[PDB]
Symmetry: D2
Subunit: 388 residues, 4 copies
Amino acid sequence: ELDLHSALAWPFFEPRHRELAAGIEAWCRANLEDVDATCRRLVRELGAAGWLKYGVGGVAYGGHGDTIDTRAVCLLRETLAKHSGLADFALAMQGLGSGAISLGGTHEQKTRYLPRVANGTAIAAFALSEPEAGSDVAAMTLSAREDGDAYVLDGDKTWISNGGIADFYVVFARTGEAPGARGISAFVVDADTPGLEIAERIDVIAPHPLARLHFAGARVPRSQMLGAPGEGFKLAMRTLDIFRTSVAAASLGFARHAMAEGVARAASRKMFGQTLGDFQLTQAKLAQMALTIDSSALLVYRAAWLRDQGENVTREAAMAKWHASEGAQQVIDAAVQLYGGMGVQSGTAVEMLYREIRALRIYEGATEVQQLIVGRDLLKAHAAATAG
Amino acid sequence: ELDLHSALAWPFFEPRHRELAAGIEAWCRANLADVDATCRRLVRELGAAGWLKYGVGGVAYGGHGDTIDTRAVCLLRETLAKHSGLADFALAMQGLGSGAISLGGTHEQKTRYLPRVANGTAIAAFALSEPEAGSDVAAMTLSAREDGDAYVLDGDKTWISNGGIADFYVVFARTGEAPGARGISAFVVDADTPGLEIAERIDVIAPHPLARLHFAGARVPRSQMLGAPGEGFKLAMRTLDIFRTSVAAASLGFARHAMAEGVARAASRKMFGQTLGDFQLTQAKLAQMALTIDSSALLVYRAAWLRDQGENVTREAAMAKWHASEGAQQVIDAAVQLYGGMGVQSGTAVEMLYREIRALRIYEGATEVQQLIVGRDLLKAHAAATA
Amino acid sequence: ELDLHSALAWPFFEPRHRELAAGIEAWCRANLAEDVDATCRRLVRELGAAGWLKYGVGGVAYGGHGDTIDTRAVCLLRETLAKHSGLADFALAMQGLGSGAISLGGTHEQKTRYLPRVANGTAIAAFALSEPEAGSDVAAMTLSAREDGDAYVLDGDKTWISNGGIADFYVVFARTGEAPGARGISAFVVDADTPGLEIAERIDVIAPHPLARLHFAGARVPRSQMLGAPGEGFKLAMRTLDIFRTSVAAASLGFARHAMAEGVARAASRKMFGQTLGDFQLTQAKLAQMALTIDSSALLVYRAAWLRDQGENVTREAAMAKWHASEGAQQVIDAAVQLYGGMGVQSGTAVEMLYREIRALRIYEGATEVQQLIVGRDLLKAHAAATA
Amino acid sequence: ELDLHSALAWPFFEPRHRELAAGIEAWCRANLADVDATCRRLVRELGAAGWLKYGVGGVAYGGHGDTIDTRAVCLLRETLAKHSGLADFALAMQGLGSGAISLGGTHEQKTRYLPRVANGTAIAAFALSEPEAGSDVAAMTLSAREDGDAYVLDGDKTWISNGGIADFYVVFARTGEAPGARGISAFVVDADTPGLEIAERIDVIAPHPLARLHFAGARVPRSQMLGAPGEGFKLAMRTLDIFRTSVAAASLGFARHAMAEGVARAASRKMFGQTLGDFQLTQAKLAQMALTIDSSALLVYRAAWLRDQGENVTREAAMAKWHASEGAQQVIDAAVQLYGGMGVQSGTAVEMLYREIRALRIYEGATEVQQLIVGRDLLKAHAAATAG
Ligand SMILES: Cc1cc2nc3c(=O)[nH]c(=O)nc-3n(C[C@H](O)[C@H](O)[C@H](O)COP(=O)(O)OP(=O)(O)OC[C@H]3O[C@@H](n4cnc5c(N)ncnc54)[C@H](O)[C@@H]3O)c2cc1C
Ligand SMILES: Cc1cc2nc3c(=O)[nH]c(=O)nc-3n(C[C@H](O)[C@H](O)[C@H](O)COP(=O)(O)OP(=O)(O)OC[C@H]3O[C@@H](n4cnc5c(N)ncnc54)[C@H](O)[C@@H]3O)c2cc1C
Ligand SMILES: Cc1cc2nc3c(=O)[nH]c(=O)nc-3n(C[C@H](O)[C@H](O)[C@H](O)COP(=O)(O)OP(=O)(O)OC[C@H]3O[C@@H](n4cnc5c(N)ncnc54)[C@H](O)[C@@H]3O)c2cc1C
Ligand SMILES: Cc1cc2nc3c(=O)[nH]c(=O)nc-3n(C[C@H](O)[C@H](O)[C@H](O)COP(=O)(O)OP(=O)(O)OC[C@H]3O[C@@H](n4cnc5c(N)ncnc54)[C@H](O)[C@@H]3O)c2cc1C
Ligand SMILES: [Cl-]
Ligand SMILES: [Cl-]
Ligand SMILES: [Cl-]
Ligand SMILES: [Cl-]
């Protein structure tokens, strides 16, 4: 029988989502110093088990449906992150790295790339950020110069997830149709493209495959452009609008792992003639952890449910990503504190979570970017109401 | 056409809730455009329009349904509070003050009291707290001594909403069957009971009808007891449980009023060659206000939806009341700041909200009590899982 | 014997400050055991007769305590007064703020005419800068002052004017038009009996103090009543506010100390659940945070006051003090309200009055947000100077 | 000349502290441009340069003075931490690890141990915590059984800084004179004691030498006891009371490093046609970082100055340690955020600080322990005032 106190009972969810949640949890329980090899193995395993189909749009191209089920992608990342940051990362990048193709690819492009993404035989990547511009996407400087039937790419992308091991990169570059955000085009760039160089492998506090890409006159056929020339900025933004809610879901999963560790330690740690959990400060701290988790989860699945009605979720996805990532930091930090010295011992669950969560407040748009999106949207909506 | 970005589109709501939300908003616009006199008027107007029926249980007794639709009660309080703290208070007390009769009354008691509560011709009140015992209800000292066919009541209740204007008070008193929480009984005490004295009117920062009640040997018939002797504590707690999420909903309504004031002021206040809303600090503050409101609203209506499925919501309602009241304080405080000096000018919308919100963090389970409820429940659930 | 754990033992203080602190506390106990106008008039007279208004006036020859203003002394006076009575603090504060522009920029005649009467409490001072459309943005004020022979003709409105309606004179800042914006403002001492000066309305705020909107209907002000040179009024206003900025922080601190005393006493005395409120961990942690905020605020206040008294500009330090003490006092007072339960919102209890009293101190004399920007800009300015 | 805006100008400091601050900064620039080997080298270098003398009490035993100059130890840790967590740790443990000997040793014990601590040829350690008892010191279970002229020690200590490389351990053990906190004695245990085993080397998120010690019937001569039997708990608490303020100082130094990184990045990072520092959110963030640093520093040096008057600082040291460690976490976290993706890049200054700070909220008494110390002290002082 359905536990009506579980979040899966919320009417944001359909029965298929409850079955999916049980299925991915069982996969995690049964299947979960070399992050490159681990990523490759996880992509293959998740692909063979069918879990990468949810991040791809189009049944003809290997997707679960013709739309991307945001609630499903979120439940997958939430459950994976609750067990393994590496497994979450692997599934996430098959979505984010292929999303621009689901959204904007031709028939040939969707046929060539999406089935292999969906079955885990091609590793995807999303190459937007640059050393000098991550938040300020509209001012990117990687250039794409038209030369006959190809574009010639020159410059650098960096912080690129799966960099060095991806089979292709969706690359955004300045083609120059108009200034700023109106001068960008999107390309699918196969990893074996001559002139695409892995300039540096990047180490971060919670290790994942990351690289700086240097484009040294790399030639990309015009037929590899996603969408129309100069329409690449909106494609990047629309791809991020899908998967920002999934970053919120991963944050939530990390927080749920910390919550489980924290309540177990509160119950088991004997001190002062009782247990840690018998103290009011512990009870109030656990309560706030749980409150943050429930508010995060409600925001995540409100946004995912809304996108699954066919609606734009620029505001609601930003809210979810902001709240869940900032909140998960607080939950994880509290769980570290409950563990005392063991909370900073290398390789304990909460020590790993303390490292894992920090980047989620930065990638797919930093917290401060999300806040300004929401604040600007509030004033835009008020101005529209005043007009009418 | 349903705006799919509106909270009313959430699947926590049924079609009847969307119709109700439009109806109570229309009533507010038509009717909210001497505190005791205002409350009396509001109760009668809400009653005549049908809005007090939602807080009464039992169609036979004037209620909207045989169960209380807590999503409906929440939407009513949220909408009323967004327009007027007094209007929210008037509806809220008709619910809280009669809830113990809906839960525990006999057929005669329900017939005698609930139809007049539901049509706004009897003002209800809930008399639990005492000068020395508010949070610690189990230690109350108001005594009820059995004497023939009546009980004799001696002692004080205080902080009693609608004190002095109520037509009856649901009074919880120690009958002494067992120590502490096991020795309390509940009574419906008519305002005209000899020995029931309105001892002092209480002034609070957001003025509402409030009084200290002194019981000077007030004789209450045994047939006015609600439930069995010694079962009054559970009745008080279950009555408060009905309306807990609706206190969160009122907080949310106050926050939404503050948000509307803040956004409008940010857009309209010219300064430094632009508007206040053009500054990043303003945009970030407005964004946090909106985030707090959406998280509060989701917590309120998750809890209300869950209770309406027939489930106990100890943890979820505590989360809603805690988050919405603490969050509304923050939203209101930010709106005061956006208004500058006008934010503390008496009678401006945001100055009134700054006063109105403060008590909601204190009554019906102070924030600190809500934290402990949630924390203890987390540990209880973990113990059950590991057993 | 000096209690070495008391803040007055800090080496930020000199012996004279310890003596003053005892004196003003004694005065409060003897004199501070409805009709706000009459109360303020009485408090100004009593503070004046006791010698306490001399510390906010510059120049021994003009009734001041010293030829410079002893900021540490003014802070201790406001801190102590506010700890007992918001009205008494207000009375002393406005004798300083309302006369500071004369201490700074008056001629010998102007200082002799006004400052001795401010210092002995026989003239109530006021500072008229803000306007309905220009509070934070002082440089855009629109009250006009037109030269006409031996006088200036003033037209327009000031508002939120403390002591408005009961002041004997107003230091008014008006646009004389020598140059745009902040460079076209002049300052005038305007006696309350000036024909054309009208009390347009009395203003009611949440913690009632005498306040008014002033309307100037062609008020002719003698040219000899100008403070400083034409067009130099803006810097005079800013320097006048600068004198007393730390003292607003000190008042905030005094309100917080009152709330702290109320909270600890209630925690100790309120019986509940077979013990006292103070026996609960949440109460102990809350009291501890109140005390931490108070000590941090006090250290920031008197660091800034000590530094100014060394002859140094304290742009960053005074902004930090006013920001931290006012925001922190709000938190301390809010926690004390919570400890009192229903009594915390009962009209006229100590903590209910403090909840109303503190709110405006975060808004006037540079709102919190303005203080944050002052500090942030100064950090960047100092960094630029270091790397130049 | 003395920059009067510098914290070193505060009257909490004497001229010798300003010269010491300059001297240790110069040492850092000249010397900090295998973790076990690194710590051994740092202890030797700091000892040879004279900097370990400040943590030792008694001129006859190699100390700088007959008292421990708290302000000096704090300035040393603050400056070292601002450059290197390893160097801070090395100096800190020469203090904490020998403090019980400075406080409670006989002439013979001080002569044997302190001169080599002070010149860096003996590495000290403080062995109090146990796997089952860290916060709840009074319930420790390591047993010391008297047997002739020696005590036989059995059990484990853990989280022991310098474990595995220390030359001696000050070990607190239950001798059983009375229950709980009244049954503990202190011993100096040479590292070569038979029956003392380094059972496990411990890895933490910011690596420092750490071990679990196992005592398997280790015979410790009675002459190695510090103080009287059963008086060991107070000796442990008094040792922590000295150095808790120095943990606050180290926290402050880490925060100052993060502040320097953050303001530099704000000034240099171009974005959106300007720099990161031109945005209000950045200015307010930097302002709050600076406010937290100044309030932390004021609390640190108020506590250090007060202890250096000969006064107990249980409340003031707890306040400093709590505020500075929690505040430094916030400052460092903000600096990570300002750096974007580079903020989590391994080995960058701010990424290292994010790992370094986390343990300081846990060791020498967790934040929650400090809050309860302060809260209980407020109620104790109120009860004493009521009684008087
Ligand atoms: C582990 C990891 C994985 C990543 N994966 C990918 C990937 O696969 N593909 C990819 O393209 N990128 C990826 N990124 C890069 C990431 O998207 C960027 O780091 C991020 O967008 C921030 O850009 P930045 O590092 O250049 O920081 P900056 O743009 O320099 O921003 C620095 C800080 O400034 C603040 N800020 C930003 N804008 C404003 C503003 N307008 N006003 C005020 N404050 C502001 C924010 O706090 C921000 O963190 C990844 C990063 C990490 C750490
Ligand atoms: C405007 C208003 C209307 C009200 N209306 C009614 C009404 O109609 N009927 C009625 O019966 N009552 C009513 N009340 C009273 C209200 O229920 C009580 O004020 C409330 O229960 C708190 O009791 P108290 O005031 O005695 O505070 P106390 O019991 O003294 O509690 C003081 C504070 O202690 C803290 N605290 C409490 N328990 C714990 C704990 N276990 N651990 C740690 N901290 C704790 C909380 O912060 C609390 O605010 C109203 C109150 C107000 C202000
Ligand atoms: C009780 C009281 C007494 C007063 N006494 C006096 C007196 O005696 N004399 C006198 O001349 N004035 C006095 N004032 C007026 C006071 O100085 C102004 O209220 C204050 O300067 C704010 O101006 P404002 O009200 O017009 O708000 P606004 O200028 O409209 O500002 C509204 C809000 O905008 C925000 N803000 C401001 N600037 C920025 C910015 N650059 N970036 C981002 N956010 C920003 C702040 O949060 C501010 O509160 C008093 C006010 C009060 C409430
Ligand atoms: C890097 C590092 C270096 C260290 N160096 C040394 C050293 O050299 N020597 C040494 O003896 N020890 C050392 N320690 C151990 C350290 O002092 C302990 O970890 C610390 O005292 C916490 O004890 P614990 O780990 O057993 O946590 P616990 O005692 O289990 O406490 C867990 C958490 O409970 C909370 N808590 C504690 N008491 C209460 C209470 N009464 N009420 C409510 N909440 C409470 C706190 O948040 C605490 O963090 C070090 C630890 C680290 C991480
Ligand atoms: Cl389905
Ligand atoms: Cl319906
Ligand atoms: Cl002196
Ligand atoms: Cl000296």
